Amino acid sequence: ASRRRAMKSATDNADDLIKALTLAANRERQAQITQEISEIVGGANAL
Amino acid sequence: DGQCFLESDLFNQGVRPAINVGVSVSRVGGAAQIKAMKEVAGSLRLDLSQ
Amino acid sequence: YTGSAIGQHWMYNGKHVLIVFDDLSKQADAYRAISLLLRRPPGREAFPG
Amino acid sequence: YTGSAIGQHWMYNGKHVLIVFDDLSKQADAYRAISLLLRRPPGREAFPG
Amino acid sequence: XXXXXXXXXXXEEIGTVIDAGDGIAHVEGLPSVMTQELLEFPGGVLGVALNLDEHSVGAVILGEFEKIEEGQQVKRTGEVLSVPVGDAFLGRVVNPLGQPIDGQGDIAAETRRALELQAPSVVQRQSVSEPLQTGIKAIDAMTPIGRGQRQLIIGDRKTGKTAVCVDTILNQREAWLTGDPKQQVRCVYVAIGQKGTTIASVKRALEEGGAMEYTTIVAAPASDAAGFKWLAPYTGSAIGQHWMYNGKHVLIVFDDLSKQADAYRAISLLLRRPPGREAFPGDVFYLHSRLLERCAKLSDELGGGSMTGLPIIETKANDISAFIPTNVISITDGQCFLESDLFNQGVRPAINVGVSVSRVGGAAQIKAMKEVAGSLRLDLSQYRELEAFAAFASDLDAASKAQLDRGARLVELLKQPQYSPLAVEEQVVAIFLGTQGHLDSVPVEDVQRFESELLEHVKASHSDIFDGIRETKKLSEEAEEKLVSVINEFKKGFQASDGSSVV
Amino acid sequence: IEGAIEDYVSSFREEIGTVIDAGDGIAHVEGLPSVMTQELLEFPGGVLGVALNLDEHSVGAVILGEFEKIEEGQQVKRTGEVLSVPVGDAFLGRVVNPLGQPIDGQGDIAAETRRALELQAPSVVQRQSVSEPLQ
Amino acid sequence: TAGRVVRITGPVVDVEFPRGSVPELFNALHAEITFGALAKTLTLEVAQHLGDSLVRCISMQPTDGLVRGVEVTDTGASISVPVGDGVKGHVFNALGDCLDDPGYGKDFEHWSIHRKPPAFSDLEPRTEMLETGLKVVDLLTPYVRGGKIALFGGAGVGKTVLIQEMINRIARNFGGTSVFAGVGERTREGNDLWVELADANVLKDTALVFGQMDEPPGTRMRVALSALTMAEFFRDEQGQDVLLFIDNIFRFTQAGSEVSTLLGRMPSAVGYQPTLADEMGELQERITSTRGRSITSMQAVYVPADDYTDPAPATTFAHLDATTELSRAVFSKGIFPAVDPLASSSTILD
Amino acid sequence: TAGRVVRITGPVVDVEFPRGSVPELFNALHAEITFGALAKTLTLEVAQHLGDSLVRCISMQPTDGLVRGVEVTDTGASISVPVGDGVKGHVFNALGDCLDDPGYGKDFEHWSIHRKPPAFSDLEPRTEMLETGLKVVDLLTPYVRGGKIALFGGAGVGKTVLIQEMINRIARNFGGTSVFAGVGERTREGNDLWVELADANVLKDTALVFGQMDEPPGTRMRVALSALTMAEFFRDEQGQDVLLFIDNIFRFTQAGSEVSTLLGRMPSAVGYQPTLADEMGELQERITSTRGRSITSMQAVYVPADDYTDPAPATTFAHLDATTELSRAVFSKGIFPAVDPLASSSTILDPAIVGDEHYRVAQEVIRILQRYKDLQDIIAILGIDELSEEDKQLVNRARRIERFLSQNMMAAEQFTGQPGSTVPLKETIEAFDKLTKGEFDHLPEQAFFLIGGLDDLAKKAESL
Amino acid sequence: EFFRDEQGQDVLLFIDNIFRFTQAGSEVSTLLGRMPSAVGYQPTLADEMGELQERITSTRGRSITSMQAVYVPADDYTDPAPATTFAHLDATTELSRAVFSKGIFPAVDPLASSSTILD
Ligand SMILES: Nc1ncnc2c1ncn2[C@@H]1O[C@H](COP(=O)(O)OP(=O)(O)OP(=O)(O)O)[C@@H](O)[C@H]1O
Ligand SMILES: Nc1ncnc2c1ncn2[C@@H]1O[C@H](COP(=O)(O)OP(=O)(O)O)[C@@H](O)[C@H]1O
Ligand SMILES: [Mg+2]
């Protein structure tokens, strides 16, 4: 029974970790795309 | 209209061709299948999802 | 485009055709090159609009 | 580069030399600054081409 | 000789638009135009002369840029970027240009004030030592707002930010009805990028509550051009500052300030300025600080006025560590983070008691509330962690269980419905009920009713409680004994929705 | 004055342009007032272009393959047709380049018709619902 | 008075006009493409004024075959689309030209697609619930009259069935009419929709406007405003409640970003146009109730990489009041109309 | 003869001068704005020469109201600030104008804010430890008397609390003369500080220069130089030892970027100016303790989006001898002052300077906390119970060590009401040695929060 | 190519490292006047690299065995240069730092590496 309780707790913790990691990864995706576009456009505006 | 996804992990695990049947879709669907195939494959997707 | 043009003649005459494009990512890359050489304005992932 | 020249003199005169560069990331930053002030279009991560 | 020859040689201006695109224009002529001068175009449209080149002037167009075209005449207004201002704005809905949008009538403006007037310096200001009652138990108890303070209302989509600020505006009516300007707070509600229906709903709520006697709305709805969204906070602060320097007390709400950042991003990128982090231009900080530093309490040598700011910021998925959130957190004197994970469960207003802070602190809190409630913050934080622990404790000591029930009943106490601001004289009693433990015998499901009824009990009989609190701002023992007597008398008459009495 | 300028301009039967610039697979050709977007341009070395860009001063033409042979000053003649490819049943079993020319060397191709590369697609009213399998 | 094409770069065309006759921006211009295999009359929308009487325009149709120096004739108005009762039951493109019967609707009253939202004084001061008559919708996720409802799903979850149902609902319970904006829609899927709505005989009460993917982004951008203009006419002049379907709004945003890039405007964040929020507002704020009549909207909304922080969904979801998600796990049980009661949500449930 | 304005773009102004009378770089120019209540005299600083007798200048005041064609007169010298023993006790701005007394300092000696750093031959490294009385600082990041100290962190994690606390720890007793440069921090904090330094009677021995956020970037970047000039005057001429507080120095680089985007220079990485490292270095190298004299500097560094990799903090890391680094995560745990023990560093934390007893304890604590920070990835999922005993025994005291690094600072008294605590170095060493050896492993974690010394630890534990 | 065509004696061509080719191309691009593409390579990358790679082919009756080493910037196998090079090859022995750090040497990634003759 204690194994049940602790494994449910671990599943919930893993769910919240997946949520936070997904959020951070999406922010990194957006930041990467924005930095790439800013670099391309700075190169364009240099010429 | 429809996307068939081929993923390398399934390719290595032994599933070849590597169609990720759980994510590949077709918006046309059964209209493209002959009746003999509907009589059979209908339950296939549910079985593989379970 | 020329593959599709060759297919369309069969299509409009009442034939059934199958077209495989292998692969359009390099079509997009080639168009990106052509466009950037013409000094057209780039957008996301350096592709034109 | 001047460090490398002071080294190469001893080197080619038959001596053994040791050169420590502390640190080359600052040289990359300075070269970036110089190139951007000269208005060369930068490459990846704003570094000179 | 050369000087006289030079003089002999040297011996109503109108310009022309040469280029126009997407909310910006370039104008020929106007040699004598001032920077940031409010130009006007034939179509009944205004513009701000940002860039003055050697041959042409760059003008950001305010309003309908559709009406502009090449070859149009442009003429000076002779006024630096400015808005009309006066007492007549009280009760009107105006666009960033000071023009009426409600169709209620013209504006009997007193004067005109420029937007770029610098904030009061270090030597002119005074300490925030005066309470701006918001009427939200979860705020006035733990995160008090002082007059001259900047309190961020940062939160997630659909979390009751506008509701909280409307409650804060409504609560000031009890003071407005007194004629003394020292209590007579007046308000401005700057709407940036909000839906027109939401602005109409706020207008309606304030009218129904009587708040429109003293509230001014500046509306930059999502439909209008980026320039209106960019100016709306500055024109709101300009309307406020005229009252502020005259010795009035002002309350400014910005709803919401992130969309001004987005509008300035748009404007900057259309001018082709190189963007920085999150595609924002490098000077968004000088946007939000230039706006929020205007808010202050002035020294008595300059008039004892003040202006209080409640900026709202929308956070992407509660990522408080984003660029604009951290920039505004670095400007304001505190934040009340409204967590969505609590809002959906029913904790409303969803103030995160752990992350929320008032960096002025208890200096602006009245002594009664300061004594009754000052323990509540840490008790609720430790209750939250105790709950996070006990959620999976098969058994635990009786003391933990009692602290857990006390915390649950305090949390149930803090919440209150929309548009129901409670006077401080009632908030102190509402928090007394909980902190001193008189709720220890009422079931959770009834607590919110219990309090709301008792405040009416004490309202009909034994008014000397609220009056004694109000007239001295401290809860004296001669009143506390009558309070406890009334509480115990009411407990016998009250009954729960189910089960036994409440002792 | 306009009359003399117009006389001189018109004195300049089909028009011929001149390459003013070339590099990395592109060529800028001045002249050709009547050129149209995506017209096949033929240069003197036998190489072809598409004329994908039309500025005030000069056409920008992407060059198909044999770029090296281009030089400044070369005469650029225009073909009177937008990009077109031959079509027919003779293509079955052949390998062709994007211009319909045989690349397998088995021999010529008995072209049957010619079609533009950028013709309009069948519209909403012309189509039918998919009900037949592609096994 | 007529202009001349001076530059051509992809879908973008620059036109020089006589000194005094420069057209107002967003005006529609007509030009000719005379090559036989590509014969067209080309529609250009004025985007900017560049000076020297040059005008930067984006083409609504392919520029292939276009020649320099060709005559351009200003129409003196914005892109205009036909409005009236006869618009019901027919398929239109963004430019208001019929696809089911070429030449239909020329005699109809034409309205500019670029028109302002209602004044502040005309808006309803409070949100009224819409009693559509479906149990799950009315109970778990009530809809708002004149609000926006996001719709999630796909094939095999009953989407088009829900569309036909809401059309019948509006046409029989409220006496209104439906408008369907196929913003960036598949041509095959549009023919399927046309034949399905014809088979159910709800087409007589639905106006279809398809901006296809086959055509450049300007048209994919303006199709939504055309459909919303027909809906506005039905709201104001005929006095009917209207239900506007937008499928898919993310492609409105995408087309806006692409047109922004072609015009050479610097991109913002992850890569949308700088005017993203204002450009979406000028559409959504227009979908509202006034003077007793309402335009309700159902909006299918894609979410790239299923993150709700991307500026496109982040901007879209700020404007919309309800969310209905269809689930295959509910459809497979025989539960129609398959609305997921837990994933779906609504902000008027208070 | 004088020049004329010919272009205006925000605070940046281009001025044309007669053929042969062009001003040198960093020269100050005066121009007039005469609209109305907005009228004022603008000071412009020459930043570039554009050729054809045209020069580009940075305005120290908002350009609103400046019309083209107005005349501009060259002062022939850089922006000059007052210096002298009379500077102490009053408040100044970037241009040398006293705010407490407008006419004050006009008659004092004036020094140019632009000066070259001291010769390398006159530099000498400092090693004398400074005892602040904060456990985490004194243990893991010992400050240097006469060195450069910095406090990093994001928004809302303790810059101001800890900065005024360090003011109480050093300036309240420092025998020398203090200078406080407010570079782009909020004005309300400046007023609070001006009041507090008078309440504590320290004001008479310190000078204040303010450049708060409302001011345009041009002066917002020069405020630091303005204050540094007074600091280095007190250093080189009076021979006194000096404390130079600066908050916040990141806003200097931010204003540099703002002015850079206007000057027309191409952007670097995420959007800062080029020469970022060169401007920051020209600023920081002037703040150094030359041979025979000392200038102790404590700086605050902002970190946007908590991105410690942002080029500006990453650049300023190179100039500092001690670097306390705050963190969001530690702040969320309720730890205060919320210093990250593993990221922060100090160059004098070596046995030759601090002694073996100090070094061994510091490194054992770092080892324990590092093992803890490595196990965190499992702790977050499966809890402490999954760990083996050698790891669990370690984590149990790791949590306690972490929490014990907290302290009830004097500055926080105004928020928590709990009085402040100062602890001597030896007692901190003893306490952390005992903790690592386990002499306190039997007490509960909550006992360790915000204590202070060991006797207060016992007193608190007795109550639980 | 001389050894291949004019003599017919089979030959082994080794190239180390063929990424520096397109790298130098990218270095000269911005100076020539080409607008930079994605992460910062020249736009001509695909065709500039193909004009080279297609020459190493072994026409019938006369073989060339090519062995070319490719650098992967930032260990980012997604970078346009490796992603373009991958198409021109029959066998790819993809090394990885993750394996090298485990002491496995020659450190080939068994999973990513591929060959067309494994039929
Ligand atoms: N005091 C309250 N108690 C319970 N629910 C509330 C309260 N205030 C607001 N709400 C809920 O939130 C809705 C309005 O929230 P509000 O408009 O303040 O959100 P918001 O933060 O302004 O979001 P947005 O900025 O997107 O409009 C109400 O319709 C109601 O559902
Ligand atoms: N020991 C502590 N206990 C409680 N609160 C603290 C403590 N230390 C700091 N704080 C809080 O942290 C805040 C610090 O804000 P500040 O450092 O000025 O942020 P920033 O400099 O980024 O604007 C203060 O308002 C204070 O209330
Ligand atoms: Mg709101």
Ligand SMILES: [Mg+2]
């Ligand atoms: Mg601070």
